[PDB]
Amino acid sequence: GSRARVYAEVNSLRSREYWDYEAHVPSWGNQDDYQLVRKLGRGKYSEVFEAINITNNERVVVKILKPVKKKKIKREVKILENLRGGTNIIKLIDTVKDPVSKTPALVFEYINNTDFKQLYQILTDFDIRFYMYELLKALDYCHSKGIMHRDVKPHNVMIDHQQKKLRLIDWGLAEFYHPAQEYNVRVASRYFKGPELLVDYQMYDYSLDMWSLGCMLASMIFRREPFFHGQDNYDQLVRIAKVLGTEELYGYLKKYHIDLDPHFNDILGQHSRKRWENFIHSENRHLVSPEALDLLDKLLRYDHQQRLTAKEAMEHPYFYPVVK
Ligand SMILES: Nc1ncnc2c1ncn2[C@@H]1O[C@H](COP(=O)(O)OP(=O)(O)NP(=O)(O)O)[C@@H](O)[C@H]1O
Ligand SMILES: [Mg+2]
């Protein structure tokens, strides 16, 4: 068994209506109130548009949802409503359907994002501290609201660098945390999956997001992006073990009584834990500091329980320059 060290019982302390998303009934407005101007994003068969609300001339974003079960739409909508107004959470403005096809769509506030592949190349140490702190505010908020994001990665973090503004987007994988609940391990994107997912441990919690955040921090300070670049979900665990060490992996598995599938033993091999300083070289030295490495070491830990919480991370010395 396992439970979150923070915010474990919050949902049980709230009204059932808060977390019982299957009982939520969205009101679907008419998408003809929205003029779709420009397709946003890099790809992945995405259907996200810059739009203008024709009734008030406000710029928004319309995300047309691919065919999915109503239950998953209700979950995302309810989570977005519960988080509305939270620090650095994207704001859901409306839920609409095209009046002909009846396809549902979500209307969001617009943020003038710069794609991370371009932005991360020009960030300074200070900027990485600043944006990581802003992202932690969003995660502490959602965790405090009983929700795990489950898909933290650069692609889901919108940053307007000129206005120093950040929003955490794409709540389609998010889920309410309930102690002892067994969750689907088919969440997050490969490079950002925590070890718990890769070894099929279902009793995970908010700390999954803190692994993903650590992966982001590592890529930002070291400039190896993604940081753990598995060729498939099995090799993903090997890439982690080559850094954190194999003995430490088997200690984690023992603690939680996790049986590693036997095929893993041959590919895992034997690896000592690496010092994080080993990743420093001339291309990243101006982004790395002892404080950054200490924080990173406290995020990227096999044992999900031992990872820093979002609030603990916000209190780390790495963020002293950006707290005030
Ligand atoms: N509120 C927004 N403002 C500006 N751009 C946005 C906004 N929401 C989404 N985008 C852009 O649309 C892209 C895709 O958004 P996203 O919600 O992640 O779609 P998706 O199809 O679900 N991708 P995935 O992360 O694989 O699930 C983002 O990476 C942005 O480029
Ligand atoms: Mg996304």
Swiss-Prot record:
Constitutively active protein kinase whose activity is not directly affected by phosphorylation. Seems to be regulated by level of expression and localization. One of its GO terms (biological process) is negative regulation of apoptotic signaling pathway. It is an enzyme of class 2 (transferase). It comes from the Eukaryota. The modification Phosphoserine is found at S12, S15, S282. The active site is at D151. GO terms for molecular function: ATP binding; protein serine kinase activity; protein serine/threonine kinase activity. Residues 34-319 form the Protein kinase domain. Keywords: Acetylation, Apoptosis, ATP-binding, Cell cycle, Cytoplasm, Kinase, Nucleotide-binding, Nucleus, Phosphoprotein, Serine/threonine-protein kinase, Transcription, Transcription regulation, Transferase, Wnt signaling pathway. It catalyses: L-seryl-[protein] + ATP = O-phospho-L-seryl-[protein] + ADP + H(+); L-threonyl-[protein] + ATP = O-phospho-L-threonyl-[protein] + ADP + H(+). Its main location: nucleus. GO terms for cellular component: acrosomal vesicle; chromatin; cytosol; nucleoplasm; nucleus; protein kinase CK2 complex. PANTHER family: CASEIN KINASE II SUBUNIT ALPHA (PTHR24054:SF34). Can use both ATP and GTP as phosphoryl donors. Phosphorylation by casein kinase 2 has been estimated to represent up to one quarter of the eukaryotic phosphoproteome. Belongs to the protein kinase superfamily. Ser/Thr protein kinase family. CK2 subfamily. This is Casein kinase II subunit alpha'.
